[PDB]
Amino acid sequence: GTTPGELRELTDDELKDKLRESKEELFNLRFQMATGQLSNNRRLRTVRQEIARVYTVLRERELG
């Protein structure tokens, strides 16, 4: 995973692009697991927490 501390060092633009990459990778991992070719299960959890972290920093940056 990528640390929140280094997540706050980016602007809203690269934050949104990283969020888009995270969503795409989650899509691919879901399809991989459905087809049964995914050995490392924790990728799903890590990418989910990553999406959540990006949303959280975005919301905090908007607020204060």
Partner 1 sequence: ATITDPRDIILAPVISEKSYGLIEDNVYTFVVHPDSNKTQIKIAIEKIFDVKVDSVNTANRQGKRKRTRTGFGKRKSTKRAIVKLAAGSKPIDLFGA
Partner RNA sequence: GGAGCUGUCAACCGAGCGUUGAUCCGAGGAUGUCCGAAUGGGGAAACCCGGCACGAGUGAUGUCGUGUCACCAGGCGCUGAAUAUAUAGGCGUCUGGGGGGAACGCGGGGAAGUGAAACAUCUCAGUACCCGUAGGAAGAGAAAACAAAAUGUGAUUCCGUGAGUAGUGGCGAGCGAAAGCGGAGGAUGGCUAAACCGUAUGCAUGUGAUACCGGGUAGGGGUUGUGUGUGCGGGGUUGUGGGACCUAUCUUUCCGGCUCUACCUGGCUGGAGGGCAGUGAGAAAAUGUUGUGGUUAGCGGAAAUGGCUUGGGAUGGCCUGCCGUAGACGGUGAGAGCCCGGUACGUGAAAACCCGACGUCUGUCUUGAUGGUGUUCCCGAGUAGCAGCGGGCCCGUGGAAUCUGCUGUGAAUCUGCCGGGACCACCCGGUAAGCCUGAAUACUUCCCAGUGACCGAUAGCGGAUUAGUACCGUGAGGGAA
Partner RNA sequence: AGUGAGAAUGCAGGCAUGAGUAGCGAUUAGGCAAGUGAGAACCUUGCCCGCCGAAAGACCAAGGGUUCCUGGGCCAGGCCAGUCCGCCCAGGGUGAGUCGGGACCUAAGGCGAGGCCGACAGGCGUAGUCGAUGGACAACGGGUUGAUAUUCCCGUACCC
Partner RNA sequence: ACCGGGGUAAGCCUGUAGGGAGUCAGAUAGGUAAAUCCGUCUGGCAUAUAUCCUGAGAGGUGAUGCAUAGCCGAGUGAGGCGAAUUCGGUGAUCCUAUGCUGCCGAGAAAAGCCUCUAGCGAGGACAUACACGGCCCGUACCCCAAACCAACACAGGUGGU
Judged by CB under 7 A, the residue of 42, 47, 48, 51 near RNA is: 42
Closest CA to 54 of 15, 13, 24, 20: 15
> Which of the stretches 9-17, 20-28, 34-42 binds RNA when contact is defined by CB under 7 A?
34-42
Q: How far is the CB of 14 from RNA (least distance, A)?
A: 18
Residue 32 interacting partner from RNA, partner 1, none (CB closer than 5 to 8 Å by kind): partner 1
What are the distances in angstroms from CA 36 to CA 17, 23, 28, 30, 40?
29, 20, 12, 10, 11
